[PDB]
Amino acid sequence: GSRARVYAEVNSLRSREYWDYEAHVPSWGNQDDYQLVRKLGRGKYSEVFEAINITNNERVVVKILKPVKKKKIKREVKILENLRGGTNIIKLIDTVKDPVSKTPALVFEYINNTDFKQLYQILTDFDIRFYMYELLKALDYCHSKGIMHRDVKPHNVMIDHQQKKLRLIDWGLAEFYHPAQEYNVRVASRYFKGPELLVDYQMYDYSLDMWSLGCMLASMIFRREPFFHGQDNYDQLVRIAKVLGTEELYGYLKKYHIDLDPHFNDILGQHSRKRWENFIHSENRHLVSPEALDLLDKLLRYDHQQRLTAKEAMEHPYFYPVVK
Ligand SMILES: Nc1ncnc2c1ncn2[C@@H]1O[C@H](COP(=O)(O)OP(=O)(O)NP(=O)(O)O)[C@@H](O)[C@H]1O
Numbered sequence: 001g002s003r004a005r006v007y008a009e010v011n012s013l014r015s016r017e018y019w020d021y022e023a024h025v026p027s028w029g030n031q032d033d034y035q036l037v038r039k040l041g042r043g044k045y046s047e048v049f050e051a052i053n054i055t056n057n058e059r060v061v062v063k064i065l066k067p068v069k070k071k072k073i074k075r076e077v078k079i080l081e082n083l084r085g086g087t088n089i090i091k092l093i094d095t096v097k098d099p100v101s102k103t104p105a106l107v108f109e110y111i112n113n114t115d116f117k118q119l120y121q122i123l124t125d126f127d128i129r130f131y132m133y134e135l136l137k138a139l140d141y142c143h144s145k146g147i148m149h150r151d152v153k154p155h156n157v158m159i160d161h162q163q164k165k166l167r168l169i170d171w172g173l174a175e176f177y178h179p180a181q182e183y184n185v186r187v188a189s190r191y192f193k194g195p196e197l198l199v200d201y202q203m204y205d206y207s208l209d210m211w212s213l214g215c216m217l218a219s220m221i222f223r224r225e226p227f228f229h230g231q232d233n234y235d236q237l238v239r240i241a242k243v244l245g246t247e248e249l250y251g252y253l254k255k256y257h258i259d260l261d262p263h264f265n266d267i268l269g270q271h272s273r274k275r276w277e278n279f280i281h282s283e284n285r286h287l288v289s290p291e292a293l294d295l296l297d298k299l300l301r302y303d304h305q306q307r308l309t310a311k312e313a314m315e316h317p318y319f320y321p322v323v324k
């Protein structure tokens with residue numbers, strides 16, 4: 001068994017209506033109130049548009065949802081409503097359907113994002129501290145609201161660098177945390193999956209997001225992006241073990257009584273834990289500091305329980321320059 005060290009019982013302390021998303025009934029407005037101007041994003045068969053609300057001339061974003069079960073739409077909508085107004089959470093403005101096809105769509109506030117592949121190349125140490133702190137505010141908020149994001153990665157973090165503004169987007173994988181609940185391990189994107197997912201441990205919690213955040217921090221300070229670049233979900237665990245060490249992996253598995261599938265033993269091999277300083281070289285030295293490495297070491301830990309919480313991370317010395 002396992003439970004979150006923070007915010008474990010919050011949902012049980014709230015009204016059932018808060019977390020019982022299957023009982024939520026969205027009101028679907030008419031998408032003809034929205035003029036779709038420009039397709040946003042890099043790809044992945046995405047259907048996200050810059051739009052203008054024709055009734056008030058406000059710029060928004062319309063995300064047309066691919067065919068999915070109503071239950072998953074209700075979950076995302078309810079989570080977005082519960083988080084509305086939270087620090088650095090994207091704001092859901094409306095839920096609409098095209099009046100002909102009846103396809104549902106979500107209307108969001110617009111943020112003038114710069115794609116991370118371009119932005120991360122020009123960030124300074126200070127900027128990485130600043131944006132990581134802003135992202136932690138969003139995660140502490142959602143965790144405090146009983147929700148795990150489950151898909152933290154650069155692609156889901158919108159940053160307007162000129163206005164120093166950040167929003168955490170794409171709540172389609174998010175889920176309410178309930179102690180002892182067994183969750184689907186088919187969440188997050190490969191490079192950002194925590195070890196718990198890769199070894200099929202279902203009793204995970206908010207700390208999954210803190211692994212993903214650590215992966216982001218590592219890529220930002222070291223400039224190896226993604227940081228753990230598995231060729232498939234099995235090799236993903238090997239890439240982690242080559243850094244954190246194999247003995248430490250088997251200690252984690254023992255603690256939680258996790259049986260590693262036997263095929264893993266041959267590919268895992270034997271690896272000592274690496275010092276994080278080993279990743280420093282001339283291309284990243286101006287982004288790395290002892291404080292950054294200490295924080296990173298406290299995020300990227302096999303044992304999900306031992307990872308820093310979002311609030312603990314916000315209190316780390318790495319963020320002293322950006323707290324005030
Ligand atoms: N509120 C927004 N403002 C500006 N751009 C946005 C906004 N929401 C989404 N985008 C852009 O649309 C892209 C895709 O958004 P996203 O919600 O992640 O779609 P998706 O199809 O679900 N991708 P995935 O992360 O694989 O699930 C983002 O990476 C942005 O480029």
Ligand SMILES: [Mg+2]
Pocket residue numbers: 155156169170
């Ligand atoms: Mg996304």
